[PDB]
């Protein structure tokens, strides 16, 4: 159930990012109504700038957590499926690639690495041999609709929000800004 709980956590922080985006949209709409209207006072404007900066930082880090959680669930599902299939019919591709596997099994470490890279090249040319047809397939049997809903490519807004990057000192001061904003909101 590790894959299922990982996907549940991915959905959880995706929903957290959605709530962050909702709060952000509220921030831009109030900012635009205040600037369009009689924005006479400027202290509220400074507070708005202070909150919106850390809000952009929060949605950036939420996009980051969403993206590497998606990568985590994708790779764990891929490795589980590969383990299951390759254990079901291990002897077939074993006899298909027997000489280099024997080279790997009873030789030294550098010879093992050479066997690994030779098998890498063999599998690369294997994939290039058949990808020309490009016949349509479906997802894994046990993980079809979960990956259909989450999708391989994530939301475009997710990758767009990750264009900008912050220095670690900037990240630390933005975390401090988030903490003080939470303290202000609590009051």
């Amino acid at each position: 159930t590790a894959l299922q709980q990982a996907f549940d956590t991915c959905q959880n922080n995706k929903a957290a990012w959605l709530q962050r985006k909702n709060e952000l949209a509220a921030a831009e709409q109030e900012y635009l109504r205040l600037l369009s209207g009689e924005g006479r006072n400027v202290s509220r404007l400074d507070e708005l700038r202070n909150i919106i900066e850390v809000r952009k930082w929060q949605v950036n880090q939420a996009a980051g957590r969403y993206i590497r959680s998606h990568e985590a669930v994708q790779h764990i599902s891929i490795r589980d499926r590969l383990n299951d299939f390759m254990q079901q019919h291990g002897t077939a591709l074993a006899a298909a690639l027997a000489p280099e596997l024997m080279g790997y099994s009873e030789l030294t470490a550098i010879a093992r690495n050479c066997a690994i890279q030779r098998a890498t090249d063999a599998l690369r040319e294997a994939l290039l041999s058949w990808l020309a047809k490009g016949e349509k397939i479906n997802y894994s049997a046990q993980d079809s609709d979960i990956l259909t809903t989450i999708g391989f490519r994530p939301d475009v807004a997710s990758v767009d929000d990750s264009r900008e990057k912050f220095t670690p000192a900037q990240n630390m001061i933005f975390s401090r800004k988030s903490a003080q904003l939470a303290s202000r909101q609590s009051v």
């Binding site: 400074d46 700038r49 202070n50 900066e53 900037q170 001061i173 933005f174 401090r176 003080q180």
Partner: peptide, 9 residues
């Protein structure tokens, strides 16, 4: 200065 203003400004 960090607490009083934003990082961008």
């Amino acid at each position: 200065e960090e607490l009083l203003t934003t990082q961008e400004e």
